[PDB]
Amino acid sequence: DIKMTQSPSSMYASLGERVTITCKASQDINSYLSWFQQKPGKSPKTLIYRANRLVDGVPSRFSGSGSGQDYSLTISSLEYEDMGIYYCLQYDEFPYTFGGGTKLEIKRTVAAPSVFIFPPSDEQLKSGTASVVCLLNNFYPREAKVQWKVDNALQSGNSQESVTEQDSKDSTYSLSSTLTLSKADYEKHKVYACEVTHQGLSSPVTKSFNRGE
Amino acid sequence: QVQLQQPGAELVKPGASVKMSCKASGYTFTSYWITWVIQRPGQGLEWIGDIYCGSDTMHYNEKFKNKATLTVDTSSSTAYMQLSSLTSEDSAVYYCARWWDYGSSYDYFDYWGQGTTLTVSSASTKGPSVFPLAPSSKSTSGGTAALGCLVKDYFPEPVTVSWNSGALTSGVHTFPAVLQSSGLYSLSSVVTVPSSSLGTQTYICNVNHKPSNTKVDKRVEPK
């Protein structure tokens, strides 16, 4: 019944910056608010209960404040381990209601992608398909354009991309592009490349390979 | 040593029922509360209901009434949440968490479970095929070499891909699986390793797909 609205929903930040997020309640919950923080795909962790008290193991930089309808969660010096999505939960009235979430993404210096490319495995060719993987490791920001080229001819219609969450140690994104062809069509061309065009590179980086090798 | 164990994933045919287990271990079971939370991926969180393991005194969510039925087994020290009339909407992640001093003014969630990735679909499960992403001349960058394993043509998610049975962790990259046009999933798990140690070290990826009950351990080598 009680609606909790957070702001901002998404936000960037640097290292060591003092960042505060807000969790406003539709009613007066009388300081009965807890702060949760979750990393992508993992279990949530309890940070603060009753909006101002630390859980054992919570770093000293996490602070809580607020009363009545408005509450805040502050980080003293933002570090590369505090990323993820932050949720606030009021437990004063039934039923309990969470917020929309607050995604904290770390801003760092521009990083160039480590471009790799793998030929299709020999076991896969015995099945009838061929999967060529172009790899982009340890780059930032996330926005990167990858283009597949076979025999210098641009291909579009059979590629699938995937970029992981922001790294917990280096604050970087990593992308993986998968090009799947039939066994006959893969053995029809010679040079297979993937053009990686990114902000951290003044010129497109190309990694190619031939079939025979 | 407090520990709460939830299954990795549960495949459910639509319309049928299922049970999610939350096995508590290492502490006094009948002296605490347990709360279930559902998380549909990418969205927020939602409270299902508070349950006391030892008086069966519950606190249900109004919208989750007539849908969820919570249970506790004091023998196995395990909590249970059963879902009925399962549709394509209920496919989400379900957590279980423990309360400390529930009811008092100093109550909060002190321990969390891993979470059950529940996917409701009528399609049959298919095991994955694991192909090695071998290191090559085009797979190195300044004394570092990248190798991996391609987990392809499986359903449904999630699949867990570990390296050397967990012996190697630094520099692993398990990418989110993409949905094929055929209706299957596929991902790759890559690791950046030193190049000089490629002749002496062994890199075996341990792919485990419990929904299909098939576990593939494929060794990947150069050339």
Residue numbers in the entry:
A (entry chain M): 1 to 48, 50 to 214
B (entry chain I): 1 to 52, 52A, 54 to 56, 58 to 74, 76 to 82, 82A, 82B, 82C, ...
Paper text:
Sialic acid-binding Ig-like lectin 15 (Siglec-15) is an immune modulator and emerging cancer immunotherapy target. Sialic acid-binding immunoglobulin (Ig)-like lectin 15 (Siglec-15) is a single-pass transmembrane protein initially described in osteoclasts. Siglec-15 triggers a signaling cascade through its positively charged transmembrane region after association with the immunoreceptor tyrosine-based activation motif (ITAM) adapter proteins DAP10 or DAP12, regulating several biological processes including osteoclast maturation, bone remodeling and susceptibility to fungal infections. Ligation of Siglec-15 suppresses antigen-specific T cell responses, and monoclonal antibodies (mAbs) that block the interaction of Siglec-15 to its binding partner(s) promote antitumor responses and are under evaluation for the treatment of several types of cancer.
To assist the crystallization of the extracellular domain (ECD) of Siglec-15, that consists of two Ig domains (d1 and d2) (Siglec-15d1-d2), we employed the fragment antigen-binding (Fab) of an anti-Siglec-15 mAb as a crystallization chaperone (clone 5G1232). This non-glycosylated Fab was produced by cloning its variable heavy (VH) and light chains (VL) into a Fab scaffold containing human constant heavy (CH) and kappa light chains (CL).
